[PDB]
Amino acid sequence: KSKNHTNHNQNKKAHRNGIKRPQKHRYDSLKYRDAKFRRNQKFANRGTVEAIRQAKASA
Amino acid sequence: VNIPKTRKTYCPGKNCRKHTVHRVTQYKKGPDSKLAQGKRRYDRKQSGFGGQTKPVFHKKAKVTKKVVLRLECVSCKYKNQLVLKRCKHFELG
Amino acid sequence: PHSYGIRARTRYTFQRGFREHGQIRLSTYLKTYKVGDIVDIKVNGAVQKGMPHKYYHGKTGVVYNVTQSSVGVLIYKVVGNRYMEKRVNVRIEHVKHSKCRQDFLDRVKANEAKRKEAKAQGKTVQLRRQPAPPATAHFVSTENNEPVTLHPVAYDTTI
Amino acid sequence: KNKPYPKSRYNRAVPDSKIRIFDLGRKRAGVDEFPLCIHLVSNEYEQITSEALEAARICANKYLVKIGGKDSFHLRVRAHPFHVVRINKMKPNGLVARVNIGQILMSVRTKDSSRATAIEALRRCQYKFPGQQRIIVSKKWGFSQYARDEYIEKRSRGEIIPDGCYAKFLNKRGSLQEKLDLFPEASFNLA
RNA sequence: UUUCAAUGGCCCGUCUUGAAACACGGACCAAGGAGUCUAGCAUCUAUGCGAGUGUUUGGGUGAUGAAAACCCAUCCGCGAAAUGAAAGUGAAUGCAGGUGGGAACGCCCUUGUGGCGUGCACCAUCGACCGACCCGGAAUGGAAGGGUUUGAGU
RNA sequence: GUAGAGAUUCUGACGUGCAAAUCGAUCUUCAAAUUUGGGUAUAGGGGCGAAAGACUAAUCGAACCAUCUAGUAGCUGGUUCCUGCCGAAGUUUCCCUCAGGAUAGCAGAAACUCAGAUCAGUUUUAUGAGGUAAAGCGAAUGAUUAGAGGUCUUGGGGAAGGAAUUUCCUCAACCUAUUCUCAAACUUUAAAUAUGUAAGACGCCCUUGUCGCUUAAUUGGACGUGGGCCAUCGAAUGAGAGUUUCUAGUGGGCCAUUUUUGGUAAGCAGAACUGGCGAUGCGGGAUGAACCGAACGUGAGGUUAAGGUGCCGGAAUGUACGCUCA
RNA sequence: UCUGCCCAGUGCUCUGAAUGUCAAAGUGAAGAAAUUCAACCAAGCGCGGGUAAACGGCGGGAGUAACUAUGACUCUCUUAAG
RNA sequence: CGAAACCACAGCCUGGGGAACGGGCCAGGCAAAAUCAGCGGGGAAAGAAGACCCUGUUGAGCUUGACUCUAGUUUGACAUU
RNA sequence: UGACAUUGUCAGGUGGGGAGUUUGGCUGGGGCGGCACAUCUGUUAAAAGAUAACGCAGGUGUCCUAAGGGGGACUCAUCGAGAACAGAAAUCUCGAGUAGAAUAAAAGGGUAAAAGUCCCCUUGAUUUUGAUUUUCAGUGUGAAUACAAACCAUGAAAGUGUGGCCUAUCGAUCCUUUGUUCCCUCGAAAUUUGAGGACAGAGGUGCCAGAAAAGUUACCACAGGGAUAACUGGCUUGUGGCAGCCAAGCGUUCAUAGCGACGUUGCUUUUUGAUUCUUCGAUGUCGGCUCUUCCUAUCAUACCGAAGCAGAAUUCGGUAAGCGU
RNA sequence: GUCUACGGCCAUACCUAGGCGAAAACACCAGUUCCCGUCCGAUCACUGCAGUUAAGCGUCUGAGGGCCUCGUUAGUACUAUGGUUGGAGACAACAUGGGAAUCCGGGGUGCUGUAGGCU
Ligand SMILES: [Zn+2]
Structure with missing residues (x-):
């Protein structure tokens, strides 16, 4: 007879290789953020880079 | 369902990119032009011996269909299409 | 006999507390949330909009995005x-x-x-926590606290 | 081992219980009369049917009436059959009572002279019930919860006013006027 | 090696949750007997060359003896540019960019699971450039300005 | 009724026979719609048929021969040397899918990155979430048996002088305070078990820079920069970890404990957790796939588990106190 | 010795009297043309007549008894003919 | 003079367990060469890849107002004219 | 006879006479029934999540230009006391009234200066892009969430609006059709028809990740299946029969001479049924005949007990399967 | 400390009955020309301060109904883990741990933030 669903071995199979955790990354893509926030952070990060470059060049 | 003969809604036309007055009509299928490439290929396939060459719909069900409203701009002549839910009777005005 | 609705089997999960219906306290809207904050998810039955799935009810997470009236747990x-x-x-x-x-x-x-x-x-600082230590040695006294001998009670009818 | 299956709007075809009356004797009794109580209680979890309850009720009523008269017993059947045990029709079939250990099945209150009569009556009534049952001489005054010594001390003080079979008991809660007017002999201790 | 004694040992293969099965095949022995070749594709590995790579479609030493080995020219295949249905257009603001981790190396502190400086590979991320799309857009052209986007790109 | 032509019964003989249809007795017909020789004609979706799908060279509900053809088969059978290192699944989704495939999972091989930052089928601390066990019905809802009082207002009958918009007590009804018993699709409460998160160096405090976002506003958000705290780097315990590429088999499961549903029940069917058999030998239960103990290279010595010590059978016809005659 | 009733249905037959409809081909108009739009046409067919020693019918059905079903019962329609 | 069917190996029973009726396993009853003629209780005896049923995206004979066609037949147009 | 017919080509009708092919799936065998085939609510669901059955109680393929959106005002269902008329609390007042009403359609949850009722204005039921949740393989479809870029509605405004208070109400390839633009192509160069493309939708696929599809075989065939029925064993007893317990009783009069209700504890089942563990490369299948053996739940024969003149008859009763039937 | 305005927790704050409230504030209250809306200045509006603490409001008092908190109930019910434990079974006991509800009794009957008025 069909429809033989069971969950006896599924937990054991999952724990055989364990429950893997996602790789941790310092930076996450800004596509998940607000559009206005991402657009402004682009200019804010850009200006920060020029300021650092100017400071290093002057030093 | 009852839909008014006229409604004010956004017009995607280039000359009028704002909310304008649109006249509402129900969309209907065209007259099924014979010069279409698919029709010509079907006729060429059907010619000669071999009988029916493509599936022909026999079962008929689900008389209710999605309602399509044609919105026509007053001055810009722009036409826009909207999709409604499935209803048995459609009445304008 | 099984359905996969969004709010299936949420009869008691999304219920408001007893004598806790009606107006929602306004301090929730005055609380400030920031990216990186650790928050708990507790579904409110009165607010149907912005409702998370029943799985996330009672869970804990970190906010990555903040919008006008919602967060990114x-x-x-x-x-x-x-x-x-x-x-x-x-x-x-x-x-x-x-x-x-x-x-x-x-x-x-x-x-x-x-x-x-x-x-x-x-001097030392001892900043690291420790588990519960074993009990030390004490000198329990008996003056004015003489021990009382106890005996098991005989079975009797109590009806 | 089945889940409880009471009569609800989902299944309204539950047949009527065979046993209709539950109390037999002086239902309009008094506080002074019936000072002793005898209980028949099952010793395990059973599924006594309403048909068995009917037979035990008939046997107990007839025996008590013929051997002690109308005015020497107030037997009542505590069990109320609500669970349904299904039987295939040749689907609810009948009503049974779910009783655990220590749950009173039959409770009779008589006088001190009728202790042996009540013991004999509830001993003969055991054959009409599935499983094992025991008979205990209750230490409480009638069907009330208070024990013998507590009840007599309460009666001596004057905190009990009979009202039909049961009675009203004084408590240190509520307005003083509504209790002082009702109780003339209540000695409110000023402490 | 044969045999005796003690103890243990069910008939192999197969389908099957489960075979010693009253499930199937098998009386015995010898010989034969079943994942091979080809046109492709994908991963990995080895070899040669390397922004190139592939002599054998073909021609010559070649008659002696030459189905081999060796030599030789122009096409062409794949790669060096992508994107769009197409008309078409077509990849550097910079050290061919910034950030974090990061091999190896160098310099110190003193023994450290130590600091400083660059930083290969790889991953994550913020940008820049090319094509397409959506824009404004100051006869034909889309030069500058853009974008919540899109490509198997630089 | 003989010859000839047939084949009813014995359901006889035989039934690896004399015989791939025969033998014996019996029986039908026997001068015509009779039997039969030779010649000739009709050929396979055709012939022929007093019609049985009958006959058509022992082959007929479509003859035989050769080729297409080594036709296809989700089905059955088989599939040939050794030893080492590993080692499953009968589960998710989709498919005119249910004896089959694709997909994910379980596995092997090839590796690569790195090795002190971080992990964990675990506990502790701190902080969330649940509505099952239990409990309650004089607390909401439903179900449930019977008493006491109010209810001079028809919710039922006559009577008091036919007589009453004046009254009685059985009739029902409402309310009040005790009182009997329940709820998987009731609940104020509410466990145990299970479950989410965190346990500082990518850390904590001040200086300062960017922005086209935001604020009345350098206001704030985010990203940063430079300096102080680097000696319990902030619970216990343990342990090297992670990421790729390709591919095999599997996609019928079953048993036991516990929690259950459907069933009168079932060595029944269907769900959840764990441990097993499948793929697990060994000691024990006289025997046994799952039960108890225990997981296995080849041996020596010692000691045990579960289980036993009258004989079979290795081990006390041991010790102490009682019960039992079947 | 008889072969009774039914042409409602499906068959068969007779109608060309509908022109209700139509293919190919031909005709008229528009267009620059492919082409489009209009009328045109035989047969078939829709009706009409006949036919049962043609197929067949001589009662169809609906809600329903202690598993269920039921057809006890509750009732209608007979329809071509009973 | 002289076969054949059949043949995993073989052949005494009871009970137990077991793929739920064993010749083999466990516990018992027991057990003595080599043979002849019968016999039909067993070997779930032999034959024959169940002919009953189910599955197969396997067929065939037959039927019809199944789908797609077709010989024939009827009518019309064009040519012969 | 005669430019008719015949013949040749094309076209319409008819054509099981004949050919080819189909005639779904799940299923406690199959068929029938039903859709558990695409779905939602409560429960089974054993307090994270997940969790099956042809388990239970029920709903769904619609409906709404308002029953969507905004704003303002009011508070419901019931209860008590009054107003007429005659029951009609129709209707009109004053108080009580935590929602016992309503919220389109099933259920659950939510809602009281509202999410309910009334009034005013409107079409955010609009265009576009990315992100996210559920079913999930983290594919598709469906449904949903929070934003961003425009145009708007409403309100004084803060704000609220990308359909219905939330949980159901739906659709790929190919083809056709519609909308769209100073869009591209018809490849020798142009113009106009026509055709083909890019982007956004709809047509129907309910067997709902989507074939175009009637039966029979009592002449039958093949590959298999004990994954699957009849049959065969084995297990179970819904039913029936049988054996004890309690004693209200009947038995002129005595509760068990003997019957003996209602219940209760068991045994058997030769009644089919339940499941599908063995058997489909094969266990010959009812009855009758013949023959042997075994059990007692004893018809007779042997010996006993119970009541009453005896003699019969009853409990066949107590042992008893030796011997007959 | 009292009052007003805006609030936070949202009944130790609600509902009921009875005693008190100096000043200020609040409220009750006096009118309809204007803005505004009703059958009705009842409510919503505007313009006011003659009159009143009587209603609202605040506070205190109930062996008050509820609500909050703490103990009894009770380590009781229940439950994780274990046995070649008992019992035919239902169930029960024990061992290593966790641990209620309800009833009853005792106590209580709002606290607090900002800005301003008050013999
Ligand atoms: Zn317009």
Whole structure:
């Protein structure tokens, strides 16, 4: 007879290789953020880079 | 369902990119032009011996269909299409 | 006999508390949330909009995005042999801060204060917690507290 | 081992219980009369049917009436059959009572002279019930919860006013006027 | 090696949750007997060359003896540019960019699970450039300005 | 009724026979719609048929021969040397899918990145969430048996002088305070078990820079920069970890404990957790796939588990106190 | 010795009297043309007549008894003919 | 003079367990060469890849107002004219 | 006879006479029934999540230009006391009234200066892009959430609006059709028809990740299946029969001479049924005949007990399967 | 300390009955020309301060109904783990741990933030 669903071995199979955790990354893509926030952070990060470059060049 | 003969809604036309007055009509299928490439290929396939060459719909069900409203701009002549839910009777005005 | 509706089997999960219906307290809207904050998800039955799924009810996560009236609680959910990142947009009515984080912040502040104080005093600081130690040796006295002998009670009818 | 299956709007075809009356004797009794109580209680979890309850009720009523008269017993059947045990029709079939250990099945209150009569009556009534049952001489005054010594001390003080079979008992809660007017002999101690 | 005694030992293969099965095949022995070749594709490995790579479609030493080995020219195949249905257009603001981790190396502190400086590979991320799309857009052209986007790109 | 032509019964003989249809007795017909020789004609979706799908060379509900053809088969059978290192699944989704495939999972091989930052089928601390066990019905809802009082207002009958918009007590009804018993699709409460998160260096405090976002506003958000705290780097325990590429088999499961549903029940069917058999030998239960103990290279010595010590059978016809005659 | 009733249905037959409809081909108009739009046409067919020693019918059905079903019962329609 | 069917190996029973009726396994009853003629209780005896049923995206004979066609037949147009 | 017919080509009708092919799936065998085939609510679901059955109680393929959106005002269902008329609390007042009403359609949850009722204005039921949740393989479809870029509605405004308070109400390839633009192509160069493309939708696929599809075989065939029925064993007893317990009783009069209700504890089952563990490369299948053996739940024969003149007859009663039937 | 305005927790704050409230504030209250809306200045509006603490409001008092908190109930019910434990079974006991509800009794009957007025 069909429809033989069971969950006896599924937990054991999952724990055989364990429950893997996602790789941790310092930076996450800004596509998940607000559009206005991402657009402004682009200019804010850009200006920060020029300021650092100017400071290093002057030093 | 009852839909008014006229409604004010956004017009995607280039000359009028704002909310304008649109006249509402129900969309209907065209007259099924014979010069279409698919029709010509079907006729060429059907010619000669071999009988029916493509599936022909026999079962008929689900008389209710999605309602399509044609919105026509007053001055810009722009036409826009909207999709409604499935209803048995459609009445304008 | 099984349905997969969004709010299936949420009869008691999404119920308001007894004598807790009606107006929603307005301090929830005045609470401020920031990216990186650890918050708990508790679905409010009165606010139908912005409702998270029943799985995330009672879970805890980290906010990555903040909008006008919602947050970006990030959860890890088991789908088999791995965790997946779930990004739920939840209105602040279903979101409250985790008191553990406030306790952890106070503990960190106390630890740093003790560290500076011990550095000034030139002694040990003992900033690391420990489990419950075994009981030490005491000298329990009996004056005015003479022991009382107990005996098992005989069985008797109590009806 | 089945889940409880009471008569609800989902299944309204539950047949009527065979046993209709539950109390036999002086239902309009008094506080002074019937000072002793005898209980027949099952010693395990059974599924006594309403048909068995009917037979035990008939046997107990007839025996008590013929051997002690109308005015020497107030037997009542505590068991109320609500669970349904299904039987295939040749689907609810009948009503049974779910009783655990220590749950009173039959409770009779008589006088001190009728202790042996009540013991004999509830001993003969055991054959009409599935499983094992025990008979205990209750230490409480009638069907009330208070024990013998507590009840007599309460009666001596004057804190009990009979009202039909049961009675009203004084409590240190409520307005003083509504209790002082009702109780003339209540000695409110000023402490 | 044969035999005796003690103890243990069910008939192999197969389908099957389960075979000693009253499930199937098998009386015995010898010989034969079943994942091979080809046109492709994908991963990995080895070899040669390397922004190139592939002599054998073909021609010559070649008659002696030459189905081999060796030599030789122009096409062409793949790669060096992508994107769009197409008309078409077609990849450097910079050290061919910034950030974090990061091999190896160098310099110190003193023994450290130590600091400083660059930083190969790889991953994550913020940008820049090319094509397409959506824009404003100051006869034909889309030069500058853009974008919540899109490509198997630089 | 003989010859000839047939084949009713014995359901006889035989039934690896004399015989791939015969033998014996019996029986039908026997001068015509009779039997039969030779010649000739009709050929396979055709012939022929007093019609049985009958006959058509022992082959007929479509003859035989050769080729297409080594036709296809989700089905059955088989599939050939050794030893080492590993080692499953009968589960998710989709498919005119249910004896089959694709997909994910379980596995092997090839590796690569790195090795002190981080992990964990675990506990502790701190902080969330649940509505099952239990409990309650004089608390909401439903179900449930019977008493006491109010209810001079028809919610039922006559009577008091036919007589009453004046009354009685059985009739029902409402309310009040005790009182009997329940709820998987009731609940104020509410466990145990299970479950989410965190346990500082990518850390804590001040200086300062960017922005086209935001604020009345350098206001704030985010990203940063430079300096102080690097000696319990902030619970216990343990342990090297992670990421790729390709591919095999599997996609019928079953048993036991506990929690259950459907069933009168079932060595029944269907769900949840764990341990097993499948793929697990060994000691024990006289025997046994799952039960108890225990997981296995080849041996020596010692000691045990579960289980036993009258004989079979290795081990006390041991010790102490009682019960039992079947 | 009889072969009774039914042409409602499906068959068969007779109608060309509908022109209700139509293919190919031909005709008229528009267009620059492919082409489009209009009328035109035989047969078939829709009706009409006949036919049962043609197929067949001589009662169809609906809600329903202590598993269920039921057809006890509750009732209608007979329809071509009973 | 002289076969054949059949043949995993073989052949005494009871009970137990077991793929739920064993010749083999466990516990018992027991057990003595080599043979002849019968016999039909067993070997779930032999034959024959169940002919009953189910599955197969396997067929065939037959039927019809199944789908797609077709010989024939009827009518019309064009040519012969 | 005669430019008719015949013949040749094309076209319409008819054509099981003949050919080819189909005639779904799940299923306690199959068929029938039903859709558990695409779905939602409560429960089974054993307090994270997940969790099956042809388990239970029920709903769904619609409906709404308002029953969507905004704003303002009011508070409901019931109860008591009054106003007429005659029951009609129709209707009109004053108080009580935590929602016992309503919220389109099933259920659950939510809602009281509202999410309910009334009034005013409107079409955010609009265009576009990315992100996210559920079913999930983290594919598709469907449904949903929070934002961003425009145009708007409403309100004084803060704000609220990308359909229905939330949980159901739906659709790929190919083809056709519609909308769209100073869009591209018809490849020798142009113009106009026509055709083909890019982007956004709809047509129907309910077997709902989507074939175009009637039966029979009592002449039958093949590959298999004990994954699957009849049959065969084995297990179970819904039913029936049988054996004890309690004693209200009947038995002129005595509760068990003997019957003996209602219940209760068991045994058997030769009644089919339940499941599908063995058997489909094969266990010959009812009855009758013949023959042997075994059990007692004893018809007779042997010996006993119970009541009453005896003699019969009853409990066949107690042992008893030796011997007959 | 009292009052007003805006609130936070949202009944130790609600409902009921009875005693008190100096000043200020609040409220009750006096009118309809204007803005505004009703059958009705009842409500919503505007313009006011003659009159009143009587209603609202605040506070205190109930062996008050509820609500909050703590103990009894009770380590009782229940439950994780274990046995070649008992019992035919239902169930029960024990061992290593966790641990209620309800009833009853005792106590209580709002606290608090900002800005301003008050013999
Ligand atoms: Zn317009």
